Structures are given as C-alpha cells and as structure tokens.
Amino acid sequence: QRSRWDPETGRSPSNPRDPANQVTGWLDGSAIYGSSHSWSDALRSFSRGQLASGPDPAFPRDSQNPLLMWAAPDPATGQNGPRGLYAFGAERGNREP
Amino acid sequence: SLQEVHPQVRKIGVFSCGPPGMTKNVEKACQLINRQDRTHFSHHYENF
Amino acid sequence: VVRDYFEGSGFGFGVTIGTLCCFPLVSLLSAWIVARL
Amino acid sequence: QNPISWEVQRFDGWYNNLMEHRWGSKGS
Amino acid sequence: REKFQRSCLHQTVQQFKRFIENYRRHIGCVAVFYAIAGGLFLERAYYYAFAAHHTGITDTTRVGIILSRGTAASISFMFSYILLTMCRNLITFLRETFLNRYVPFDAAVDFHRLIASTAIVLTVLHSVGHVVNVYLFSISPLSVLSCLFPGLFHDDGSEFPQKYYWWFFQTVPGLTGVVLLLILAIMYVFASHHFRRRSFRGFWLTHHLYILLYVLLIIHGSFALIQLPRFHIFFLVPAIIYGGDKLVSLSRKKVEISVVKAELLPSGVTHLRFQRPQGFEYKSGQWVRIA
Amino acid sequence: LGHTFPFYAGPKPTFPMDTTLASIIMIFLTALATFIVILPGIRGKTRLFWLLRVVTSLFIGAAILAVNFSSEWSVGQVSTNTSYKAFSSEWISADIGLQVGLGGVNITLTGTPVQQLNETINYNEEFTWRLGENYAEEYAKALEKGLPDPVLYLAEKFTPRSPCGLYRQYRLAGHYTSAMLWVAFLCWLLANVMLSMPVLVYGGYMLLATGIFQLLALLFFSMATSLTSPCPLHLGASVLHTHHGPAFWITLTTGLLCVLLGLAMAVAHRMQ
Amino acid sequence: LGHTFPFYAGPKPTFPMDTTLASIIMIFLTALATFIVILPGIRGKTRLFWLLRVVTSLFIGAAILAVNFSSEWSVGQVSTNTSYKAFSSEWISADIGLQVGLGGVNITLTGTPVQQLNETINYNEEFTWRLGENYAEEYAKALEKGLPDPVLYLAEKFTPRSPCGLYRQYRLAGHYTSAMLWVAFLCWLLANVMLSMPVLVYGGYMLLATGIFQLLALLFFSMATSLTSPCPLHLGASVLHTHHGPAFWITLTTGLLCVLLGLAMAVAHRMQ
Ligand SMILES: *[C@@H]1O[C@H](CO)[C@@H](O[C@@H]2O[C@H](CO)[C@@H](O[C@@H]3O[C@H](CO[C@H]4O[C@H](CO[C@H]5O[C@H](CO)[C@@H](O)[C@H](O)[C@@H]5O[C@H]5O[C@H](CO)[C@@H](O)[C@H](O)[C@@H]5O)[C@@H](O)[C@H](O[C@H]5O[C@H](CO)[C@@H](O)[C@H](O)[C@@H]5O)[C@@H]4O)[C@@H](O)[C@H](O[C@H]4O[C@H](CO)[C@@H](O)[C@H](O)[C@@H]4O[C@H]4O[C@H](CO)[C@@H](O)[C@H](O)[C@@H]4O[C@H]4O[C@H](CO)[C@@H](O)[C@H](O)[C@@H]4O)[C@@H]3O)[C@H](O)[C@H]2NC(C)=O)[C@H](O)[C@H]1NC(C)=O
Ligand SMILES: *[C@@H]1O[C@H](CO)[C@@H](O[C@@H]2O[C@H](CO)[C@@H](O[C@@H]3O[C@H](CO[C@H]4O[C@H](CO[C@H]5O[C@H](CO)[C@@H](O)[C@H](O)[C@@H]5O[C@H]5O[C@H](CO)[C@@H](O)[C@H](O)[C@@H]5O)[C@@H](O)[C@H](O[C@H]5O[C@H](CO)[C@@H](O)[C@H](O)[C@@H]5O)[C@@H]4O)[C@@H](O)[C@H](O[C@H]4O[C@H](CO)[C@@H](O)[C@H](O)[C@@H]4O[C@H]4O[C@H](CO)[C@@H](O)[C@H](O)[C@@H]4O[C@H]4O[C@H](CO)[C@@H](O)[C@H](O)[C@@H]4O)[C@@H]3O)[C@H](O)[C@H]2NC(C)=O)[C@H](O)[C@H]1NC(C)=O
Ligand code: HEM
Ligand code: HEM
Ligand SMILES: *[C@@H]1O[C@H](CO)[C@@H](O)[C@H](O)[C@H]1NC(C)=O
Ligand SMILES: *[C@@H]1O[C@H](CO)[C@@H](O)[C@H](O)[C@H]1NC(C)=O
Ligand SMILES: *[C@@H]1O[C@H](CO)[C@@H](O)[C@H](O)[C@H]1NC(C)=O
Ligand SMILES: *[C@@H]1O[C@H](CO)[C@@H](O)[C@H](O)[C@H]1NC(C)=O
Ligand code: NA
C-alpha cells in the first residue's frame, strides 16, 4: 500500500507527488517523547517529571487507547491487541523486542 | 336581558364589525356571559 | 511643494452638490408650471 | 527565578527554523 | 351616560389607551417592519464598524461608509417590499382571513406612503453619506484608492486620485445614483397629496417611473464597487408576487357600466346608483372596485 | 477634513461579546419591547398573565437558541505561568480557559495583567468540528498563523488524531445535542402556534415535548462526554479540569421549566 | 469478490464534456421527450405549429442558459512546440487553445499526439473572475499546483496585474453580458407564461424584449472586449489570435430569431 503524501503535491508535472514524514524530521528525541504534545502528555505520569510507567517502574504504561501505539498482529502466534505493547514516542516502537 | 327575553334559545350569534377596541369589548362581554352556563353566546370578528 | 488633490475642485463640487439638492426644487418648479397649465 | 530559563523545544518540530516554521515538523 | 375629565392627566391617558387599543395591529406591523429595516442597517453598521478592519475602508471614511452601506441595505429592503403593499389581489384574499386579526390590510395603501416616507429619508442619508465618501475619495492618494478598490484603480505612482466628477458621472454607481435621485425627486414631488389634488394624469405619468427606478436599482449596485449587489435578492420574491397579482388583476374582466342616479347627500356624500351587469351575483356585505 | 493620513487615526473598535449571542439578545429584546409597547392595548385582568406567558415563551426560545449556539457547555479555567510564543523564553502569568460547545471549542488566554511582555494577551480562539468543517485544517491554519503556545496546546488536544479521544466524543455529543436542541426549538415554535389555536391541550403537549427534548439533549451530552478516557490537560505546573458550564445548567433549568409547565397545563386541563 | 486490492482495478472514468452544458442538455431533452410523448394528446391540425412553438421556445431557453454558462465567447487555438514543465528541457508539440467566457477562461493544452514524454497532455483548466472569486488566488493555486508552462503563461496573461489589460475589460464584459443574458432568460420565461395567457401581444412583446436583451449583451461584449489594448500572446514561435467564438454567434442567431419572431407577432396582431 502506498504511503501518505503531501496533499499540496502530486497533481501536475511541475509539482510531482512528495511523501509526507509522519514523525518530526529533527533528531529531537521524538522517538522517546512523541511527535506531538498530546503524545508526550500521554507518555508522562506528571509526577516528579518522569515518563509514565506501569506496575513495574522499568517499563512504560501498557497501551490502552487504540490511538496510541501501532498494534500489528504477531506474525508467529497471531496475538493481537495492545495487551503487551509498551507506549513509546515512536508509534512503531514495539515492532520487535 | 337577551337571554331573558328569548328563554328557549340556546345558541346566540353576535357579529362585530367595528374598531378593534369595541369588538374586543363585545367579545369580553360574550366571554363574561358564557362564564354563566345557562346559554351560549358565539362571537365573530366580522370584517365586511 | 505640497500636492493638493482637491485644488480647483471646490467650486465644481459645491455646484454638483447644489444641483443634487436642487433636483426636488427643479421638480417642484416644473410641476408648478404644468399645474398652472 | 524560573528553573526553565530557555525556550522549551516543541514536540511537533514546529517553530524550529525562524522563517520556515514547517521545516522538520510532523507531516511535512 | 358620560363624564368629563381633567385635561392634564385623565384625558390624555384615556386618549393614549384608546389609540393603542385601536391601532395595536398598526403598532405591531410598523414595529416589525422598522425592526427588520433597523436590523439590516445595524448588521451593515456592525460589519463596517467592527468587522471590516482588514479592508481599511474606515481609515478613510468611517461615518460616510457606515451611513451609506446601512442605508443601502435598508433602502434595498424598503424599495423591494413596497411592492407588497400594492398586491391588490393578495390583499383582497387576505383581507378576510384570520391574518386580519393581526395585520390591518385595510391600511395597506397608507402603509405604502409610510414606507416611501421612510425610504426617501434614508435614501437622502445614503446619498449624503456617499457625498462625504466622494470628497474623501477625492482627497485620498492613489495608493489608498488602489487598496480600497483594487479592481478599479492601480497604484502606478501617479499619486493623483480621480476627480469628484469622475465618481459622480464616470462610474456606474455615480451615474445610476444621480439619475435615481432625479427620478425620486420627480416621483415624490408629483405624487404628493397637494399635487394629487392638483391633477390626476401627471400623478400616474410620474408614478409609473418605478419600473425605471427598479431597473436603475438593479444597475446601480451591479458594478460591485463596495460589495456584491444584494438588491436583486431583496427584490426577487416581492417582484414575483407583485407581477402575479398584477397579472391576476388583468385576468379579471372589468365590466363597463352606466350610472342611473347620483345624489349629493349631506356631509359630503355621493350616492351612486348604477346599472347592474347581467350576470352580477353577490351576497350582502360584499364590495366592488370602481373607476 | 484631509491633508493627513489616515483620515481616522483612532484605534478600531472590537465587538465586546459573541455576535451570535448578541444578535439573539437584540432580536428577543426587540420583540419584548414591541410587546411591552403593545401591552396597554391588552383588554383587562389578563395582562399580568399575558405578560408572564409572553415573557416565558420568549425566554424559552432565547434559551434554546443561545444555548445551542453558546460554546459554554464544558468550561474550565486555570491561572498559571506558561511559555507564550516561539523564539522567546519569557513566560506569562495568565488565565487559560477552555469552553467546549456543541460545534467547537473556544480557548481563552487572558494575561494577568493583560499587558505582559509589551503585548496584549486577550486571545479568544475558536476551533470548530461541525459537520463539513475540518478540525485538522483549522488547527494547521492556527499553527501557520502563530497562535500562542497554550492556545495551540489546547487546540491540538482536540485534534482527531490526538492520543486522548476528546475530539470523537465531543463531536458526537455536540452534534446530537445540537440536533435535539433544534428539535426542541421547533417544538417551542409549534407550542406557540398551537397556544394561539383554541386547542390548548395540544399546545401544552408540544411545550412538554420541548422540555423532554431539552432534557434528552442534556442527558445525551452528559453520557457522550462521560465516555471519554481521562485526558490530562497540564499547563505549566497545573492541571485544567472541565465541568458542566452554565449552558448545561441553563439547559437543565429551561427544560425543567418547560416540562413543569407542560405537566401543569395537562393536569389543569384534566381538572378543568 | 474480495481477497485482492483494490476490489475495482479499472481506470476511473472522466466525464466527457462540461457538466453544466451536459445538465442543460439533459434537462431540455427530457422536457422535449415529455412533450413528444404528450404530442398525440394534442387535438388536431395545431400539432405541427404546436411542435414548432414548443421546440423553438425550448431552444431559446437552452441557448440562453448554455451561452450564459459556456466559456466559448472569445476562442483561439494554435499548434506550436512549447516547453512543457519545470526541471525538464524537453518540448511538446501541442494545440494550445484559449476559451474566454463570461465568468472566466478555459485554457486547453492538447498534445499532438496526446501521449508525449510518457505523459497524457489533455489539460483543460479554468480560471474564473466572477464576482466574489479572486483570480489572483486561483492563479497562485495553479502555480503551487504545478500546471504546465503554456497553461500558466495564458493564465498569468489574464491576471489583474498583468501589463496587458485583458483582465479588467474581460471581467467587465463578462459580468454585464451575463447580467443581460439573465435578463433575457427572465424575459423568455415571462414570454412563455404570457403566451399561455390570452393576451398574445404582450407575450410577443416579451419575446421581442428577450431578443433585444440578447442583442444588447452581444453588443456590450463586443464593445467592452474591443477596448482592450492589443495583448500579444506569443507561445513558442507563434502568436495566438482570439476571435468571437460560437457562443457569440449562437447569441447573435438566437437574438435575431427572437427579435424576428417578436416583430412577426406584433405585425400579425396589427394585421389580424
Ligand atoms: C468563540 O470564538 C469565536 C472566534 O474568536 C468568537 O467569535 C468572534 O467574536 C469576535 C467578537 O467578540 C470577533 O472576532 C474579533 O474580531 C476583531 C475585529 O475583526 C476585524 O479586525 C481584525 C483586525 O485586523 C487588523 O489587524 C490585523 C493584524 O492583527 C491586520 O492584519 C488587519 O489588516 C487589520 O489591521 C488594520 O487595523 C488595525 C487596527 O488597529 C491597525 O492597527 C492596522 O494598522 C490596520 O489598519 C481583522 O483581522 C478581521 O479580519 C479577519 O476576519 C475576516 C472575517 O473573518 C477575514 O475576512 C479577514 O481576512 C481576517 O481574517 C476583521 O476585519 C478582531 O480584531 C479580533 O482579533 C483578535 O482576537 C482574535 C481571537 O483571540 C485573535 O486571533 C486576533 O489575532 C486578535 O487578537 C489579538 O488582538 C487583540 C486586540 O486586538 C488582543 O487582545 C489579542 O491578545 C491579540 O493580540 C496579539 O496580537 C496582536 C496583533 O494581532 C498584538 O498587537 C498583541 O500584542 C498580541 O500579540 C477578533 O478576531 C468575531 O465576531 C468572531 N471571530 C471570528 C468569526 O473569526 C466567539 O465570540 C466565541 N464564543 C464565545 C461564546 O465567546
Ligand atoms: C472549463 O474548465 C472547467 C475546469 O476544468 C471544466 O469543468 C470541469 O469539467 C470536468 C469534466 O469535463 C471535471 O473536471 C475533471 O474531473 C476529473 C475527475 O475528477 C475527480 O477525479 C480527480 C482525479 O483524482 C485522482 O488523481 C489525483 C492525481 O491526479 C489524485 O490526487 C486523486 O486522489 C485521485 O487519485 C485516485 O484516482 C486515480 C484514478 O486513476 C488513481 O490513479 C489513483 O491511484 C487514486 O486511486 C480528483 O482529483 C477530483 O477531485 C478534485 O476535485 C474535487 C472537487 O473539485 C475536490 O474536492 C478534490 O479535493 C480534488 O481537488 C475528482 O474527485 C479529473 O480527473 C480531471 O482532472 C484532469 O483534468 C484537469 C483539467 O485539465 C487537470 O487539472 C487534472 O490534473 C487532470 O489532468 C490530468 O489528467 C488527465 C487525465 O486524467 C490528463 O488528460 C491531463 O493531461 C492531466 O494529466 C497530467 O497529470 C496526470 C496526473 O494528474 C499525469 O498522469 C499525466 O501524465 C499528466 O502529467 C478534471 O478535473 C469537472 O466537472 C470540472 N472541473 C472542476 C469543477 O474543477 C469545464 O468543463 C470547462 N468548460 C468548457 C466549456 O470546456
Ligand atoms: C419610489 C417610491 C414608490 C414606489 C416604487 C411606489 C410603487 C407603487 C406601485 C407599484 C403602485 C401600483 C401601481 C399599479 O398597480 O398600477 C403604486 C400606486 C400608488 N402609490 Fe406608490 N410608490 C412609491 C411612492 C409613493 C408615494 C410617495 C405616494 C404618496 C405620497 C404613493 C401613493 C400611491 C397611490 C395613492 C397609489 C394608488 C393606490 C391604488 O390605486 O390602489 N406612492 N405605487
Ligand atoms: C449621488 C447619489 C448616489 C451615489 C453616489 C450612490 C452610490 C452608491 C454606491 C457606490 C453603492 C455601492 C454599489 C457597489 O458597490 O457596486 C451604492 C449602493 C446602493 N445604493 Fe446608491 N448612490 C446614490 C444614490 C442612491 C439612490 C437615489 C438610491 C435609491 C433610490 C440608492 C440605493 C442604493 C442601493 C439599494 C444600493 C445597494 C444595491 C445592491 O446592494 O445591490 N442610492 N450606492
Ligand atoms: C506564577 O509565577 C508567580 C511569580 O513567579 C507566582 O507568584 C505564582 O504563584 C505562579 N503561579 C502558578 C500557578 O504557578
Ligand atoms: C513595555 O513595558 C514596559 C513596562 O510595562 C514599559 O516601561 C515600556 O514602555 C513598554 N514598551 C517597550 C517598547 O518597552
Ligand atoms: C514543431 O516541431 C516539429 C518538429 O520539430 C515541426 O515539424 C513543426 O513544424 C513545429 N511546429 C511549429 C508550430 O513550430
Ligand atoms: C514512454 O514512451 C515510449 C515511446 O512512446 C515507450 O516506448 C515507453 O514504453 C514509454 N514508457 C517509458 C517508461 O519509457
Ligand atoms: Na524526530
């Protein structure tokens, strides 16, 4: 399937289609804190300036809302759902362990 | 007195064509008499 | 030199405004003439 | 005195370049 | 029987209560009509006093543009809807319905004059406002005019604006407004009560100029100098209703009859007894039209 | 007068309130003034009752319209110190307010004082999610415009793609609440029309329906905005909490008044 | 059927003509078909005359609408070799056509052959100067879109700021010609309505007015487009010359037909 592209492009020869970057092009730690402010708020516990963690302080919160983490089904076992997917700044941070 | 003079009538028609205040007075008198349930007065705003 | 845009137009502008205000007066004059005739 | 003495970097990459506010931003 | 009163308080309040109790319908109809007119005027005035800063129109003309535009909206509404007061067949149809409980259709012709009596006043203000505008446009530089009217002026450094007579006689709004003012002067002066007593044929000869007036009103705002022309929007439905009513009035066959007897009854009354047309059937209390 | 530019050098006025609410108030006050002028023409004892009926009906209609168009359903307001603009490390002390309505949200940023950093901080921005309007496009235009940071933060909190699902629930709630408020307005119009007609019981039933539809819109807004996962709005060192604004309470009071009047009308008709 | 993407892999169709003209043709052909079906219900000898009257009236109305909405008033077309796009030195052999209407201009770029440089060159772009529409904004959006060079050249030739004053004169001409064509359409409607009525002379006068307004719109377009300073449109090694297109000639023929029929009606009424 073709990827997202800039809506202002790809209709006439002088301005061909250009792909759109879905994360911030800066090397700004967006894979850690997210590419939007709401994402960063979702990743924070708002206590002592720490990223939100689950019952184990060494792991971030498990993903609950479908808007948060990419949840491609497990190719091996077929396991799906956000039941075991951690929440990172990068949407595809759980692609592999 | 119209109720009294015609005792066997039951429905009396009254039609007012005039200035709105006088016709309103006629309608108010009709309603006041109709508050008594002996006979019925039916009033019309006629505007020939 | 100060450039004045409206220079030389005050008299004509006043005449135009006066004619616009005299339109009812001209109509009254003509209507009185036709009423007499 | 405010401990945050600098301009906090935005998460979406906007307003990083002075005149090109969309540079490096999400969706660009 | 009776009772006199004290002139200062009781008689005056009695007269005022009588006036309200009689003409309550007139009060309501005049109030709603002038409320619609004032609402349109206030909409345009608000737009040009609070919501038109991006155009800079009020940096040069503030009182003039507000007056002209608000009075233009009110004038469009009034000149469009004055035709509804002359829908004789529609008035006749609604003359007996329950709407007569609220709308005094009998006073329609009177309302006609009232509408005109208001319109010309606002019209004058309209013209007056534009006069002010013109003078300011005659002293604003070419750059300001180019910003105000991009499709009419181009800032090429000439720095000298157009003259007043260019606005008044070399622009479609100017020419149409001058000719409309002349038409209004003729129509209002001739149609006045004094000169309608003076003559009858001149009254209609000048009062039929409303078709030319409406043509020139369609042309007047057509150029879209300040805003897009909205006069046709106001004028559409009342024109359709008036045209239908006039066509229906033409459709009825006006019989021609002769008078049998004429009496000069006291208190200035005329008793006219005339010949009945052959198939003339009517019920009691019905009324006719005569010429 | 000329020879100087501009011909008018005064600051341009700003309308002191919402134009829609102002127009509703002006129209209904004009109707009230007309009927007050008409009041002496009313016949007799049925003037105070007539006045109460007219004023109550006008108030019901004005409440329906204003509440349907007021962006004051879910309100919140917090005083904080926050970063103001880009390319500037200076912070502003300000009241940030969120006013979520049926068709969108108004974000207010009022400086304390208004004059801070040599700037006037009295922002009142609207972002609309009405049908046919693109919220994401409006937020992108706000980003291009350069709105202050708290405004942009609270605006992106309501974007369709934001991790906290405020946009979906609030759009659904506002859409159907507005639909049922329009139904209530139609029922109020019919209630007036059929109170003009001799069948008063049907008009009382229509007034009861107006009240029922107001209550239904209120309940739907509550239920649809309650299903939201908790979105923590954190500005500076504070958290903003939203609550049912005065539009919600005016809806409740007006609907209760309408249902009470309808029940009273029906019971009085049954008893008389 | 599923299991494959997309479910429909065929190329998507493109409408083969103008949608406005197509809609006008469909509506008037539907009316014609309805009246043809109704034709056997017509009484007697007055069928061929009835058919002529109905078909002529429908043709007049369709001509008014199509001409008012056709961008075919001032037409021109030249075959050249021109630069095609940016970041490409290759040239295309193509027919470039200009079609100036009342509300805007259609610029056509048709390749010869259509398939050149591995691309389909069949551009038909519209730039509108109607009231309320910003021509400069449309040209800027065309520049951002990346339209081929001849299209952009002929589009900027009609910008308000272009040195050759095509935009001003053509906008004025189109605006007032469209206004008078709408007046002619209204007069045609009234002509039908009053030919239904027993007073045929008034309907003939209205038909005459329709013809007069068509002629007035034609003359105004001619006069206002003649006052242009000569704008030399040079593409490649050629110059494009505009001339009165078939919309102009259809206006002339329809107006002459209407004025002739109105004069015939009036003279026949006078003679009978
Ligand atoms: C829910 O939300 C709804 C949305 O807000 C709300 O509806 C709104 O209601 C309000 C009324 O209550 C209305 O909106 C207001 O309208 C005012 C008037 O609008 C006209 O004027 C503006 C001003 O334009 C001038 O200035 C700009 C630059 O700012 C120039 O680009 C212009 O050319 C023009 O400049 C001339 O005039 C100046 C006057 O001094 C001169 O100085 C200058 O030299 C020039 O001569 C125009 O922009 C408007 O046009 C725009 O809109 C129309 C129609 O939509 C478009 O066609 C057009 O293209 C434009 O887009 C219009 O002509 C506005 O002034 C007012 O704007 C202020 O508030 C909004 C909202 O917060 C801000 O976004 C905006 O930036 C303004 O905020 C700044 O200014 C105020 C005071 O002026 C400050 O208090 C504020 O903090 C902020 O200051 C910051 O910026 C300043 C510079 O801009 C700077 O000086 C400061 O230091 C600081 O940095 C507002 O929009 C309207 O009815 C509704 N709005 C709509 C529909 O959009 C509704 O009520 C809400 N509901 C509830 C229940 O509350
Ligand atoms: C006066 O002028 C008036 C204005 O033209 C005229 O009115 C117009 O009439 C015509 C009918 O006669 C109508 O306009 C046409 O409509 C067609 C259909 O429109 C729909 O489809 C298009 C196509 O979109 C697909 O492709 C684009 C990329 O091009 C993608 O971005 C889309 O997502 C979509 O992609 C999917 O589909 C593809 C199909 O194969 C797949 O391949 C792909 O993988 C995807 O699955 C949509 O864009 C349209 O949406 C747009 O408009 C709506 C509503 O306005 C907006 O809401 C929306 O946001 C969009 O803006 C719509 O859905 C169009 O196809 C057609 O467009 C062609 O012509 C115009 C005009 O010349 C060009 O600008 C345009 O670029 C297209 O030209 C290219 O393609 C044709 C053949 O396809 C070539 O012949 C041509 O040379 C050119 O090729 C060049 O580009 C190609 C890539 O684009 C490339 O492959 C080539 O090699 C070459 O480089 C046209 O717009 C409509 O009724 C009127 N138009 C209006 C109102 O705008 C009027 O009749 C005139 N009067 C007279 C008297 O003549
Ligand atoms: C621009 C202003 C006016 C317009 C457009 C206008 C319009 C009309 C129209 C359409 C008619 C009906 C003509 C017909 O049916 O053949 C009419 C008739 C009439 N107008 Fe006016 N009018 C205007 C101003 C006035 C004024 C100022 C007066 C008096 C001071 C007036 C008094 C009358 C009268 C008495 C009639 C005849 C009523 C009747 O015969 O039923 N009008 N006017
Ligand atoms: C010297 C006299 C007048 C001048 C200079 C003048 C000027 C103007 C101008 C510049 C406009 C804006 C139109 C546009 O932007 O295209 C306008 C609109 C308008 N004027 Fe006048 N005017 C004059 C007299 C009149 C008269 C006599 C009437 C009515 C009888 C009138 C009624 C209107 C109306 C109704 C509009 C709005 C039309 C529309 O919105 O379509 N004006 N005028
Ligand atoms: C904002 O800052 C001022 C001074 O730094 C302080 O007095 C005030 O309490 C602060 N407010 C908040 C909400 O932190
Ligand atoms: C800015 O604000 C300060 C204090 O409020 C004031 O003294 C100064 O005049 C203002 N303007 C500038 C340009 O600093
Ligand atoms: C375009 O180029 C071809 C081949 O180069 C040539 O045959 C043709 O005459 C040219 N047409 C024009 C108009 O120059
Ligand atoms: C381009 O056109 C040439 C000749 O028309 C053709 O041979 C070729 O297959 C086309 N496509 C590409 C990608 O070159
Ligand atoms: Na990044």
Residue numbers in the entry:
A (entry chain C): 147 to 243
B (entry chain A): 1504 to 1551
C (entry chain A): 583 to 619
D (entry chain C): 22 to 49
E (entry chain A): 1019 to 1309
F (entry chain D), G (entry chain B): 4 to 275
Show sentences the authors wrote.
In addition to the shared TMD-DH catalytic core of NOX, the functional DUOX protein has an additional large N-terminal extracellular peroxidase homology domain (PHD) and a long intracellular loop 0 containing two EF-hand domains, and it requires an auxiliary DUOXA protein for proper function. The activity of DUOX is regulated by intracellular calcium concentration. hDUOX1 subunits and hDUOXA1 subunits co-assemble into a 2:2 heterotetrameric protein complex with molecular weight ~457 kDa. Here, we present the cryo-EM structures of human DUOX1–DUOXA1 (hDUOX1–hDUOXA1) complex in both high-calcium and low-calcium states, providing insights into the structure and mechanism of calcium activation for DUOX.
In the low-calcium condition, DUOX1–DUOXA1 complex showed low basal activity. We compared the structures in the low-calcium state and high-calcium state, and found structural changes in the extracellular layer and transmembrane layer are small. However, there are large conformational changes of the regulatory PHLD and EF-hand module in the cytosolic layer. In the absence of calcium, the EF module switches from an extended shape into a more contracted shape, which reconfigures the interface between the EF module and α4 of the DH domain, resulting in a loosely packed structure. In the low-calcium state, EF2 moves away from the DH domain. The Cα atom of A894 on αJ of EF2 has 40 Å displacement. PHLD rotates away from the TMD and DH domains, and αA of PHLD has 17.2° outward rotation. As a result, several inter-domain interactions observed in the high-calcium state were disrupted and therefore the docking of DH domain onto TMD is weakened by these structural changes, leading to a higher mobility of DH domain. We propose the increased mobility of DH domain negatively correlates with the electron transfer efficiency and thus the catalytic activity of DUOX. Removal of calcium ions results in the reconfiguration of cytosolic inter-domain interactions which in turn mobilizes the DH domain and lowers the electron transfer efficiency.
